[PDB]
Amino acid sequence: TVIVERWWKVPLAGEGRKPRLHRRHRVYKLVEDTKHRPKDNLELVLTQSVEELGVRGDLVSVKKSVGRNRLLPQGLAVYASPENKKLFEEEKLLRQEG
Amino acid sequence: PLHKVPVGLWKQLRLWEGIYSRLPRHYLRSLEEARTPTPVHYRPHGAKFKINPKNWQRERVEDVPIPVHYPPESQLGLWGGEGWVLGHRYVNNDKLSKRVRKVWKPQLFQRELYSEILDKRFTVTVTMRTLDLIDQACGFDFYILKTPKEDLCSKFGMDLKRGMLLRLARQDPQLHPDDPARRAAIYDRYKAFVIPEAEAEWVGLTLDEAVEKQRLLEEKDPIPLFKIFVEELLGQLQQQALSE
Amino acid sequence: VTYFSSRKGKRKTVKAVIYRFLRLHSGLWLRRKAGYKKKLWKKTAARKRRLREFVFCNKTQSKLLDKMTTSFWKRRNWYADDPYQKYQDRTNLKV
Amino acid sequence: AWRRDIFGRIIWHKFKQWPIPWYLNKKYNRKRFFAMPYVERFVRMRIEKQARIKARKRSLERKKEKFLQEKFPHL
Amino acid sequence: ATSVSWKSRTKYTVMPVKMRKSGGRNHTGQIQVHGIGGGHKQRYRMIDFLRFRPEHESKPGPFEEKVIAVRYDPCRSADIALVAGGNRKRWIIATENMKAGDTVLNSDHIGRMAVAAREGDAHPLGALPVGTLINNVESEPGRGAQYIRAAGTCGVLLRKVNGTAIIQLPSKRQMQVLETCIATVGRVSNVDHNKRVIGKAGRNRWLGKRPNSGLWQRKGGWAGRKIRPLPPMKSYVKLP
Amino acid sequence: GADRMSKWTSKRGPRTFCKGRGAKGTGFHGRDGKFVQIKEMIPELVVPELAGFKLKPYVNYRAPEGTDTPLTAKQLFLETAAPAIEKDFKAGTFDPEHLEKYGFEPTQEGKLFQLYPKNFPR
RNA sequence: AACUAUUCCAAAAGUUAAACAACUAACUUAACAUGGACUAGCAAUUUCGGUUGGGGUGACC
RNA sequence: CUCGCACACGCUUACAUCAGUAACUAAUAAUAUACUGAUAAUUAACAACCAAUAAACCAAAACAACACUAAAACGUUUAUUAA
RNA sequence: ACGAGCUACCCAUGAGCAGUUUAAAAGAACCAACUCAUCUAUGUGGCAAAAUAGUGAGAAGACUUGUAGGUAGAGGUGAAAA
RNA sequence: ACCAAAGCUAGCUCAACAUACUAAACAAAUACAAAAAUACACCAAAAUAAAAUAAAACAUUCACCUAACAUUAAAGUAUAGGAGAUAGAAAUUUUUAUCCUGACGCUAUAGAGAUAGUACCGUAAGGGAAAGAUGAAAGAAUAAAAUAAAAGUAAAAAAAAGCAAA
Ligand SMILES: [Mg+2]
Ligand SMILES: [Mg+2]
Ligand SMILES: [Mg+2]
Ligand SMILES: [Mg+2]
Ligand SMILES: [Mg+2]
Ligand SMILES: [Mg+2]
Ligand SMILES: [Mg+2]
Ligand SMILES: [Mg+2]
Ligand SMILES: [Mg+2]
Ligand SMILES: [Mg+2]
Ligand SMILES: [Mg+2]
Ligand SMILES: [Mg+2]
Ligand SMILES: [Mg+2]
Ligand SMILES: [Mg+2]
Ligand SMILES: [Mg+2]
Ligand SMILES: [Mg+2]
Ligand SMILES: [Mg+2]
Ligand SMILES: [Mg+2]
Ligand SMILES: [Mg+2]
Ligand SMILES: [Mg+2]
Ligand SMILES: [Mg+2]
Ligand SMILES: [Mg+2]
Ligand SMILES: [Mg+2]
Ligand SMILES: [Mg+2]
Ligand SMILES: [Mg+2]
Ligand SMILES: [Mg+2]
Ligand SMILES: [Mg+2]
Ligand SMILES: [Mg+2]
Ligand SMILES: [Mg+2]
Ligand SMILES: [Mg+2]
Ligand SMILES: [Mg+2]
Ligand SMILES: [Mg+2]
Ligand SMILES: [Mg+2]
Ligand SMILES: [Mg+2]
Ligand SMILES: [Mg+2]
Ligand SMILES: [Mg+2]
Ligand SMILES: [Mg+2]
Ligand SMILES: [Mg+2]
Ligand SMILES: [Mg+2]
Ligand SMILES: [Mg+2]
Ligand SMILES: [Mg+2]
Ligand SMILES: [Mg+2]
């Protein structure tokens, strides 16, 4: 994704009127390319035991490639979501029991 | 001479007459309001007011969306509400250099995605932004249900949504025929988005498709005048019999 | 100069004037000398002073600048603390 | 059926007898009942032209009255 | 507008089929290739370039065919031969001494002892001696012959290493192939095609060549005598 | 500059252009290339015997015209189905399910001359 | 500039060891194909200061 | 004195019969294939329109015996259905 | 936007080339039809917005020619004469 | 005395209102080579307006320029600009119904191109005309009535010598 900015300042229309655009408002400078940002990590909760990463019922951080294209399709992991998280809160409380 | 009503309003008053009048109100109210799509390519400044750096004064400030072009092949996939940016640039970024037409195209990928509710793997062209939004909303089906019409931008997204919205309002047994366990389990997590049935089949519809549908529901072969005349005659005969 | 604007149909001002001159209310215009910041090491003390002055424009220039400038810039201003308020009126002018 | 042809006019389309159903018919299938986007402009022009004609037919009649009223002021 | 290529005929026929020349024009109608058009009218003979082609899938074994006639072909430089076996005939590209009333073997079979090579014989490369002359060379096995079909051309098998053959193309470039690929043994027909003398501009027109342009172009940097080290060896062997 | 205005007719073009004047086809092209007529496509005129009947192309002048009433679906209903329906409702034998005895036809596809798709010329 | 080819970095898909020494990196790339660069081709936009015993050359400003 | 008759393409009644031509067309008259009016007319045997799918056929047109090179337009039969 | 019914070059599909000379249908020879357009004189608001009269060049070929189709202006086509 | 001259109508123009906005006419035929009743398919699509011009040249720039938001002001102000030519807001303000619709608009070289998108000119897209005048009655044409005034001619050729007159 390219994040782009205008070279010429657009005037204001404040009442809820739409801005009055001229052709010179189509000249953009390129402020960012999202694809070039240092990339983040994905946080997951494992539903089985993965070889390197860890145990069933574990919170791990991987790179989005491994997470999107291996774990999530194979049902080897689920997202970090709160509703999905409380399931393993309960599982953690009923594991250490017996 | 002059038109009595401005031509900006000819599209609107086109919808107040004829078959468009007989469309269900919730649909027309879903089309009426255009919510401002989430900023994708341009990056918005938060504040309404901003202090002018040169001037040292409080200055009113607005956000103006950057026109983005969606090629028709974007309607077959899900690009994450983004598209082609058509515009110009200065070379070297010196304002004094040549000014040149430039188009910024999204990077597209072939990825197969799994829908739980529809129980299927679609091969879809998506962007990295789409994958990040799916990640952020924690499910494919979530992402499709959880996002407004303006933010998906795809007709295919709206048809996915119409489909699984229908599957939720119906509680369709054919989802997982063998295991009602899985079925209830799945229908469970999505219970927040459940909407009635009359609403659910009109969600993803183009004005064309809508008009067509409504035309088909109204489809009737004109009633023979023999019927109508027979009913008038029975009315008259039953009021001639009851008067004596 | 634009005599009739497009949107408003009014008469625009040429800002390039507003930046380098100053109009007193009497109709006198005031300007800096040219090249007063330029190459100072090469110049006499006397000449430097002659440059540092604020000076008045002749009639022709005054009419020109007036034409290049709208009515707003000719209004009577009262500024707090203003250096030039002293100079806005004319006195003892027998003509 | 009421249809909309290439020219954006709203036309009454009479049907025709065929031995085969419509989706298997080459010749019929290459007709177009619908207008493209450019046609819209012309449609507008049509309206306007029409409106003008009506507009100055009316003004004519009105005028014919005034004249007559000063020619035969029996009122 | 749009023109349709003449090149659609689904079933193979030994009979000459009619073709439409298009002088240099693509399907859009513009000139793509300059200097082409209006030769003599030509029919086209379909050539089977897969030399090993079992008639029925029932009996897979190496089979033998008789050469009926050797005819001139307008479409290519080499002379072609009409070859019949079982119930079927096909045109194949004739080797130099192939004559009518002849016998030609087609075989996919390898063996430890190689083979004594006749002319029309087609064998897998692995089965030939290491100095042999070959033509109509496959690239991948089962693909059909592409390389070395022109008149009087011959390649040569260079060596055999690691279940693979390395051969020398007529351009003196080396080419590496699986040894399971078929090739025909010998030099292609009509060896004197090189020494033919077109007598007059007219003959060139008969061959469907339009004259060069008249514009004068100053020679550029590209021209001169460039002496380039012979290119590295092409390999169609796909490593695991 | 050729001719724009005059209509396009078989007389105008090359040999290859034959456009009928609008008579209707009586047949198809057969095996021999010869043309085959289909006896069913050729309109058969149905002509009554006029000899023993008295009416003439013109009407006597002292003969009166009449008040002009265009026939309406209603009047036709009342001259036909109304006496029968009234007779059978007064006797209580009326059956809203099957009106077929009164002359109503549920669907047209059975009978020879159908009204709505209009099977017959005249 | 675009376009057409080149080369490279990033994107995208991957793959390896559990790395080495003593008491994370590296490598891979089938066709598409994105963003930013490089080298060329093919090109795009625009211009021909004045004086001068006519202009030009020379000279001058 | 010698560009004739027909067909294709094109033109579209300018053709035919009777009548009229003061003026209109003819680069001028006489009068009329060309101006005007009225009334008629080219009749199918020629021409257009006028089957598909499989299968056997390597073998020029040239008075075609047989050949030349530049390698060549043009169909039979068999089967399956063809109102 | 519209134009390849002229013309440039193609694609399909038809058609012409008699006499004479030669073992020869050989981009040979003589010379018609046919195609060109050399030289001169006419003509110059002309018969003609490029013709007439004579005279010439080719005339089984890189030939002439009918019909239908193609390539479109930042282009096409070009035996380069912009 | 010829050629001629004179009409006052046809209609138009600009606004107002207004419902609401593709007129009229459809029997057949119309997207085969439109107007040709009748046979197994295909069907369809989008990419920023540009430049002339202004800057006394031209290279960034150049209002309006087929995208509804009007009006009184703020204001040609803040701002934006080879900081040049020029471009240019907003916050914030103001706006009382409906009827009184017409004309110091044209009158046939005008007003619509219009008697007509016709004739005609273009292969096509396309271009695109000119033209009317009797009276209550012409079912009052041995016809009756009011200009006889443009250039051009005729009635009536010219007679030494000259910007043609004074
Ligand atoms: Mg060839
Ligand atoms: Mg050959
Ligand atoms: Mg050459
Ligand atoms: Mg050369
Ligand atoms: Mg015409
Ligand atoms: Mg015809
Ligand atoms: Mg004809
Ligand atoms: Mg017959
Ligand atoms: Mg420019
Ligand atoms: Mg100069
Ligand atoms: Mg000069
Ligand atoms: Mg000089
Ligand atoms: Mg001089
Ligand atoms: Mg000099
Ligand atoms: Mg004519
Ligand atoms: Mg006649
Ligand atoms: Mg005459
Ligand atoms: Mg042509
Ligand atoms: Mg001869
Ligand atoms: Mg010769
Ligand atoms: Mg001559
Ligand atoms: Mg002579
Ligand atoms: Mg001659
Ligand atoms: Mg000669
Ligand atoms: Mg000669
Ligand atoms: Mg054509
Ligand atoms: Mg140019
Ligand atoms: Mg060119
Ligand atoms: Mg040529
Ligand atoms: Mg030259
Ligand atoms: Mg030159
Ligand atoms: Mg300029
Ligand atoms: Mg100027
Ligand atoms: Mg200039
Ligand atoms: Mg502009
Ligand atoms: Mg700046
Ligand atoms: Mg300047
Ligand atoms: Mg405001
Ligand atoms: Mg007029
Ligand atoms: Mg006019
Ligand atoms: Mg006079
Ligand atoms: Mg005198």
CSV table of all heavy atoms in Angstrom, one decimal, chain I residues 23-36:
chain,number,residue,atom,x,y,z
I,23,A,P,15.8,-23.6,-83.6
I,23,A,OP1,16.9,-23.4,-84.6
I,23,A,OP2,14.4,-23.8,-84.2
I,23,A,O5',16.1,-24.8,-82.7
I,23,A,C5',15.8,-24.7,-81.3
I,23,A,C4',15.3,-26.0,-80.8
I,23,A,O4',16.4,-26.6,-79.9
I,23,A,C3',14.1,-26.0,-79.9
I,23,A,O3',12.9,-26.0,-80.6
I,23,A,C2',14.3,-27.1,-78.9
I,23,A,O2',13.9,-28.3,-79.5
I,23,A,C1',15.8,-27.1,-78.7
I,23,A,N9,16.2,-26.3,-77.6
I,23,A,C8,15.8,-26.5,-76.3
I,23,A,N7,16.4,-25.7,-75.4
I,23,A,C5,17.3,-24.9,-76.2
I,23,A,C6,18.2,-23.9,-75.8
I,23,A,N6,18.3,-23.5,-74.6
I,23,A,N1,19.0,-23.4,-76.8
I,23,A,C2,18.8,-23.9,-78.1
I,23,A,N3,18.0,-24.9,-78.5
I,23,A,C4,17.2,-25.4,-77.5
I,24,A,P,11.5,-25.2,-80.0
I,24,A,OP1,10.4,-26.0,-80.5
I,24,A,OP2,11.7,-23.8,-80.4
I,24,A,O5',11.6,-25.4,-78.4
I,24,A,C5',12.3,-24.4,-77.7
I,24,A,C4',11.8,-24.3,-76.3
I,24,A,O4',12.9,-24.2,-75.4
I,24,A,C3',10.9,-23.0,-76.1
I,24,A,O3',9.8,-23.2,-75.2
I,24,A,C2',11.9,-22.0,-75.5
I,24,A,O2',11.3,-21.0,-74.8
I,24,A,C1',12.8,-22.9,-74.7
I,24,A,N9,14.2,-22.4,-74.6
I,24,A,C8,14.9,-22.2,-73.5
I,24,A,N7,16.1,-21.6,-73.7
I,24,A,C5,16.1,-21.4,-75.0
I,24,A,C6,17.1,-20.9,-75.9
I,24,A,N6,18.3,-20.4,-75.4
I,24,A,N1,16.9,-20.8,-77.2
I,24,A,C2,15.7,-21.3,-77.6
I,24,A,N3,14.7,-21.8,-77.0
I,24,A,C4,15.0,-21.9,-75.6
I,25,A,P,8.4,-22.6,-75.6
I,25,A,OP1,7.4,-23.8,-75.5
I,25,A,OP2,8.5,-21.9,-76.9
I,25,A,O5',8.0,-21.6,-74.5
I,25,A,C5',8.5,-20.2,-74.6
I,25,A,C4',8.6,-19.6,-73.2
I,25,A,O4',7.4,-18.8,-72.9
I,25,A,C3',8.8,-20.6,-72.0
I,25,A,O3',9.6,-20.0,-71.0
I,25,A,C2',7.3,-20.8,-71.6
I,25,A,O2',7.2,-21.2,-70.2
I,25,A,C1',6.7,-19.4,-71.8
I,25,A,N9,5.3,-19.3,-72.1
I,25,A,C8,4.7,-18.9,-73.2
I,25,A,N7,3.4,-19.0,-73.2
I,25,A,C5,3.1,-19.5,-72.0
I,25,A,C6,1.9,-19.9,-71.4
I,25,A,N6,0.7,-19.8,-71.9
I,25,A,N1,2.0,-20.5,-70.1
I,25,A,C2,3.2,-20.6,-69.6
I,25,A,N3,4.4,-20.3,-70.0
I,25,A,C4,4.3,-19.8,-71.3
I,26,A,P,10.8,-20.7,-70.4
I,26,A,OP1,11.5,-21.5,-71.4
I,26,A,OP2,10.4,-21.5,-69.2
I,26,A,O5',11.8,-19.6,-69.9
I,26,A,C5',12.9,-19.9,-69.0
I,26,A,C4',14.1,-19.0,-69.3
I,26,A,O4',14.5,-19.1,-70.7
I,26,A,C3',13.9,-17.5,-69.1
I,26,A,O3',15.1,-16.9,-68.7
I,26,A,C2',13.5,-17.0,-70.5
I,26,A,O2',13.8,-15.6,-70.8
I,26,A,C1',14.5,-17.9,-71.4
I,26,A,N9,14.1,-18.0,-72.8
I,26,A,C8,12.9,-18.5,-73.3
I,26,A,N7,12.9,-18.5,-74.6
I,26,A,C5,14.1,-18.1,-75.0
I,26,A,C6,14.8,-17.9,-76.2
I,26,A,N6,14.1,-18.2,-77.4
I,26,A,N1,16.0,-17.5,-76.2
I,26,A,C2,16.6,-17.3,-75.1
I,26,A,N3,16.2,-17.4,-73.8
I,26,A,C4,14.9,-17.8,-73.9
I,27,G,P,15.1,-15.9,-67.4
I,27,G,OP1,16.4,-15.1,-67.4
I,27,G,OP2,14.7,-16.7,-66.2
I,27,G,O5',13.9,-14.9,-67.7
I,27,G,C5',14.1,-13.6,-68.0
I,27,G,C4',13.0,-12.7,-67.5
I,27,G,O4',13.1,-12.7,-66.1
I,27,G,C3',13.1,-11.2,-67.9
I,27,G,O3',12.4,-11.1,-69.1
I,27,G,C2',12.4,-10.5,-66.7
I,27,G,O2',11.0,-10.5,-67.0
I,27,G,C1',12.6,-11.5,-65.6
I,27,G,N9,13.6,-11.0,-64.6
I,27,G,C8,13.4,-11.1,-63.2
I,27,G,N7,14.4,-10.6,-62.5
I,27,G,C5,15.3,-10.3,-63.5
I,27,G,C6,16.6,-9.8,-63.3
I,27,G,O6,17.2,-9.5,-62.2
I,27,G,N1,17.3,-9.6,-64.5
I,27,G,C2,16.7,-9.9,-65.7
I,27,G,N2,17.5,-9.6,-66.7
I,27,G,N3,15.5,-10.4,-65.9
I,27,G,C4,14.9,-10.5,-64.7
I,28,A,P,13.0,-10.2,-70.3
I,28,A,OP1,13.6,-8.9,-69.7
I,28,A,OP2,12.0,-10.1,-71.4
I,28,A,O5',14.3,-11.0,-70.8
I,28,A,C5',14.1,-12.1,-71.7
I,28,A,C4',15.2,-12.2,-72.7
I,28,A,O4',15.4,-13.6,-73.1
I,28,A,C3',14.9,-11.5,-74.0
I,28,A,O3',15.1,-10.1,-74.0
I,28,A,C2',15.8,-12.2,-75.0
I,28,A,O2',17.1,-11.8,-74.8
I,28,A,C1',15.6,-13.6,-74.5
I,28,A,N9,14.5,-14.3,-75.1
I,28,A,C8,13.3,-14.7,-74.5
I,28,A,N7,12.5,-15.3,-75.2
I,28,A,C5,13.0,-15.2,-76.5
I,28,A,C6,12.6,-15.6,-77.8
I,28,A,N6,11.4,-16.2,-77.9
I,28,A,N1,13.4,-15.4,-78.8
I,28,A,C2,14.6,-14.8,-78.6
I,28,A,N3,15.1,-14.4,-77.5
I,28,A,C4,14.3,-14.6,-76.5
I,29,A,P,14.0,-9.1,-74.7
I,29,A,OP1,14.6,-7.7,-74.6
I,29,A,OP2,12.7,-9.4,-74.2
I,29,A,O5',14.1,-9.5,-76.2
I,29,A,C5',15.3,-9.2,-77.0
I,29,A,C4',15.1,-9.5,-78.5
I,29,A,O4',14.8,-10.9,-78.6
I,29,A,C3',13.9,-8.9,-79.1
I,29,A,O3',14.2,-7.5,-79.5
I,29,A,C2',13.6,-9.8,-80.3
I,29,A,O2',14.5,-9.6,-81.4
I,29,A,C1',13.9,-11.2,-79.7
I,29,A,N9,12.7,-11.8,-79.2
I,29,A,C8,12.4,-12.0,-77.8
I,29,A,N7,11.2,-12.6,-77.7
I,29,A,C5,10.8,-12.9,-78.9
I,29,A,C6,9.6,-13.5,-79.4
I,29,A,N6,8.7,-14.0,-78.6
I,29,A,N1,9.4,-13.5,-80.7
I,29,A,C2,10.4,-13.0,-81.5
I,29,A,N3,11.5,-12.4,-81.2
I,29,A,C4,11.7,-12.4,-79.9
I,30,C,P,13.1,-6.4,-79.5
I,30,C,OP1,13.7,-5.1,-79.6
I,30,C,OP2,12.2,-6.6,-78.3
I,30,C,O5',12.2,-6.7,-80.8
I,30,C,C5',12.8,-6.8,-82.0
I,30,C,C4',11.7,-7.1,-83.1
I,30,C,O4',11.3,-8.5,-83.0
I,30,C,C3',10.4,-6.4,-83.0
I,30,C,O3',10.5,-5.1,-83.5
I,30,C,C2',9.4,-7.3,-83.7
I,30,C,O2',9.6,-7.1,-85.1
I,30,C,C1',10.0,-8.7,-83.4
I,30,C,N1,9.2,-9.3,-82.3
I,30,C,C2,8.0,-9.9,-82.6
I,30,C,O2,7.5,-9.7,-83.7
I,30,C,N3,7.3,-10.5,-81.6
I,30,C,C4,7.8,-10.6,-80.4
I,30,C,N4,7.1,-11.2,-79.4
I,30,C,C5,9.1,-10.1,-80.1
I,30,C,C6,9.7,-9.4,-81.1
I,31,C,P,9.7,-3.9,-82.8
I,31,C,OP1,9.9,-2.7,-83.7
I,31,C,OP2,10.0,-3.8,-81.4
I,31,C,O5',8.1,-4.3,-82.9
I,31,C,C5',7.5,-4.3,-84.2
I,31,C,C4',6.1,-5.0,-84.1
I,31,C,O4',6.3,-6.3,-83.7
I,31,C,C3',5.2,-4.4,-83.1
I,31,C,O3',4.5,-3.2,-83.5
I,31,C,C2',4.2,-5.5,-82.9
I,31,C,O2',3.3,-5.7,-83.9
I,31,C,C1',5.1,-6.7,-82.9
I,31,C,N1,5.6,-7.1,-81.6
I,31,C,C2,4.8,-7.8,-80.8
I,31,C,O2,3.7,-8.2,-81.2
I,31,C,N3,5.2,-8.2,-79.5
I,31,C,C4,6.4,-7.8,-79.1
I,31,C,N4,6.7,-8.2,-77.8
I,31,C,C5,7.3,-7.1,-79.9
I,31,C,C6,6.9,-6.7,-81.1
I,32,A,P,3.5,-2.4,-82.5
I,32,A,OP1,3.3,-1.0,-83.1
I,32,A,OP2,4.1,-2.5,-81.2
I,32,A,O5',2.2,-3.2,-82.6
I,32,A,C5',1.2,-3.2,-81.6
I,32,A,C4',0.0,-4.0,-82.0
I,32,A,O4',0.3,-5.4,-82.0
I,32,A,C3',-1.2,-4.0,-81.0
I,32,A,O3',-2.0,-2.8,-81.2
I,32,A,C2',-1.9,-5.3,-81.3
I,32,A,O2',-2.7,-5.1,-82.5
I,32,A,C1',-0.8,-6.2,-81.6
I,32,A,N9,-0.4,-7.0,-80.4
I,32,A,C8,0.8,-7.0,-79.8
I,32,A,N7,0.8,-7.8,-78.7
I,32,A,C5,-0.4,-8.4,-78.7
I,32,A,C6,-1.0,-9.4,-77.9
I,32,A,N6,-0.3,-9.9,-76.9
I,32,A,N1,-2.2,-9.8,-78.2
I,32,A,C2,-2.8,-9.3,-79.2
I,32,A,N3,-2.4,-8.3,-80.1
I,32,A,C4,-1.2,-7.9,-79.8
I,33,A,P,-2.5,-1.9,-79.9
I,33,A,OP1,-3.3,-0.8,-80.4
I,33,A,OP2,-1.2,-1.6,-79.1
I,33,A,O5',-3.4,-2.9,-79.1
I,33,A,C5',-4.7,-3.3,-79.6
I,33,A,C4',-5.3,-4.4,-78.8
I,33,A,O4',-4.5,-5.6,-78.9
I,33,A,C3',-5.5,-4.2,-77.3
I,33,A,O3',-6.7,-3.4,-77.1
I,33,A,C2',-5.6,-5.6,-76.8
I,33,A,O2',-6.8,-6.2,-77.0
I,33,A,C1',-4.6,-6.3,-77.7
I,33,A,N9,-3.2,-6.3,-77.1
I,33,A,C8,-2.1,-5.6,-77.4
I,33,A,N7,-1.1,-5.8,-76.7
I,33,A,C5,-1.5,-6.7,-75.8
I,33,A,C6,-0.8,-7.3,-74.7
I,33,A,N6,0.4,-7.1,-74.4
I,33,A,N1,-1.5,-8.2,-74.0
I,33,A,C2,-2.8,-8.4,-74.3
I,33,A,N3,-3.6,-7.9,-75.3
I,33,A,C4,-2.8,-7.0,-76.0
I,34,C,P,-6.6,-2.2,-76.0
I,34,C,OP1,-8.0,-1.9,-75.5
I,34,C,OP2,-5.8,-1.1,-76.7
I,34,C,O5',-5.8,-2.8,-74.8
I,34,C,C5',-6.4,-3.5,-73.8
I,34,C,C4',-5.4,-4.0,-72.8
I,34,C,O4',-4.4,-4.8,-73.5
I,34,C,C3',-4.6,-3.0,-72.0
I,34,C,O3',-5.4,-2.4,-71.0
I,34,C,C2',-3.4,-3.7,-71.6
I,34,C,O2',-3.6,-4.5,-70.5
I,34,C,C1',-3.1,-4.5,-72.9
I,34,C,N1,-2.3,-3.9,-73.9
I,34,C,C2,-0.9,-3.9,-73.6
I,34,C,O2,-0.5,-4.5,-72.6
I,34,C,N3,-0.1,-3.3,-74.5
I,34,C,C4,-0.6,-2.7,-75.6
I,34,C,N4,0.3,-2.1,-76.5
I,34,C,C5,-2.0,-2.7,-75.8
I,34,C,C6,-2.8,-3.3,-74.9
I,35,U,P,-5.2,-0.8,-70.6
I,35,U,OP1,-6.3,-0.5,-69.6
I,35,U,OP2,-5.1,-0.1,-71.9
I,35,U,O5',-3.9,-0.7,-69.8
I,35,U,C5',-3.5,-1.6,-68.8
I,35,U,C4',-2.1,-1.5,-68.4
I,35,U,O4',-1.2,-2.1,-69.3
I,35,U,C3',-1.6,-0.1,-68.3
I,35,U,O3',-2.0,0.6,-67.1
I,35,U,C2',-0.1,-0.3,-68.4
I,35,U,O2',0.4,-0.8,-67.2
I,35,U,C1',0.0,-1.4,-69.4
I,35,U,N1,0.1,-0.9,-70.8
I,35,U,C2,1.4,-0.6,-71.2
I,35,U,O2,2.3,-0.7,-70.5
I,35,U,N3,1.5,-0.1,-72.5
I,35,U,C4,0.4,0.0,-73.4
I,35,U,O4,0.6,0.4,-74.5
I,35,U,C5,-0.9,-0.4,-72.9
I,35,U,C6,-1.0,-0.8,-71.6
I,36,C,P,-1.7,2.2,-67.0
I,36,C,OP1,-2.6,2.7,-65.9
I,36,C,OP2,-1.7,2.8,-68.3
I,36,C,O5',-0.2,2.1,-66.4
I,36,C,C5',0.6,3.3,-66.5
I,36,C,C4',2.0,3.0,-67.0
I,36,C,O4',1.8,2.2,-68.2
I,36,C,C3',2.7,4.3,-67.4
I,36,C,O3',3.4,4.8,-66.3
I,36,C,C2',3.7,3.7,-68.5
I,36,C,O2',4.8,3.1,-67.9
I,36,C,C1',2.9,2.6,-69.1
I,36,C,N1,2.3,3.0,-70.4
I,36,C,C2,3.0,3.3,-71.5
I,36,C,O2,4.3,3.3,-71.4
I,36,C,N3,2.5,3.6,-72.7
I,36,C,C4,1.1,3.6,-72.8
I,36,C,N4,0.6,3.9,-74.0
I,36,C,C5,0.3,3.2,-71.7
I,36,C,C6,0.9,2.9,-70.5
